[PDB]
Amino acid sequence: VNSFSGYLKLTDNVYIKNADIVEEAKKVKPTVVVNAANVYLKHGGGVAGALNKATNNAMQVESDDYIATNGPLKVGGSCVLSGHNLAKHCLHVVGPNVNKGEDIQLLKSAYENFNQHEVLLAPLLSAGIFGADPIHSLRVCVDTVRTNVYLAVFDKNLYDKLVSSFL
Ligand SMILES: NCCc1c[nH]cn1
Asked: Out of the domains of life, which is the source?
């Protein structure tokens, strides 16, 4: 049993809810929250900008030190950093950004990072400002992640479309 409430069950391991991931993280304090990161961990907008704002910029300060030491992530890659006030840990995962021309096949590689964690609160990778089809992102998630993932979808209209169209 876990603390997540109000989710619709899509599969054995994937759950979904219309929720603001920031507000959900603050309520649940999950072991892992996933950030929709870019390779520079520049948390300007979308999910990343919202998570970072909720940490009062402490996520960005920590991320800048990570990049100064390690250099940029790979598209499809990830790193584990602090969850600050939102979670124990933040898994920063880089899905491909269609608005930069990145290979959508890298979305499966991105989701494979989730398998290193038994339970996660996450957004749909490569959705929102990264420009990919969220229906596709949900299908890749279900067909890739084997650990227990609780997906937060900010937009109610999109949530209802994801559920209604789910095979
Ligand atoms: N408060 C809205 C956070 C968010 C979710 N998705 C994109 N941004």
From this structure: Viruses
With a Cβ cut-off of 6 Å, ligand 1 is lined by 20-22, 46-47, 50, 128, 154
For this experimental structure, what is the resolution in angstroms?
1.0
Question: How many other C-beta atoms can be found within 10 angstroms of the C-beta atom of residue 60?
Answer: 19
124 CA to centre of ligand 1 in angstroms: 11
> Which amino acid, 42?
K
Q: Where are the domains of the chain?
A: 1-167
d(CA 26, CA 139): 27
Whose CA is closest to atom 1 on ligand 1?
A: 20
> Which residue puts its alpha carbon closest to atom 2 of ligand 1?
20
Ligand 1 centre from 26 Cα, in Å? 13
Alpha-carbon span 40 to 120, nearest angstrom: 22
> Strands of 32-36's sheet, edge to edge?
8-9, 14-18, 148-153, 119-122, 32-36, 89-93, 78-82
Dist. CA 142–CA 159, nearest whole Å: 15
Structure tokens that stand for 23 in this block: 């507000």
Partners of 78 in the β-ladder? 93
Experimental method: X-ray
Which of 16, 17, 18, 20 is the pocket-test mutation for ligand 1 (most atoms within 8 Å of CB)? Answer: 20
